[PDB]
Amino acid sequence: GELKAIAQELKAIAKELKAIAWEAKA
């Protein structure tokens, strides 16, 4: 349960960092 929730959190952080990486490019 707790590890699955933390896994989803880390996936979401990954998407947030990718969006920041993109905004920096554009």
Q: How far is the CB of 12 from Na ion (least distance, A)?
A: 7
Give the CA radius of gyration of the chain.
12
Residue selected from 9, 13, 16, 17 as contacting Na ion according to rule CB under 5 A: 9
Q: How far is the CB of 2 from a copy of itself (least distance, A)?
A: 6
Cα–Cα separations (whole angstroms), residue 19 to 1, 2, 3, 4, 13: 28, 26, 24, 23, 10
Q: How far is the CB of 15 from a copy of itself (least distance, A)?
A: 7
Furthest-apart CA pair in the chain: how many Å? 38
Q: Residue 26, interface with a copy of itself (CB under 8 A)?
A: no
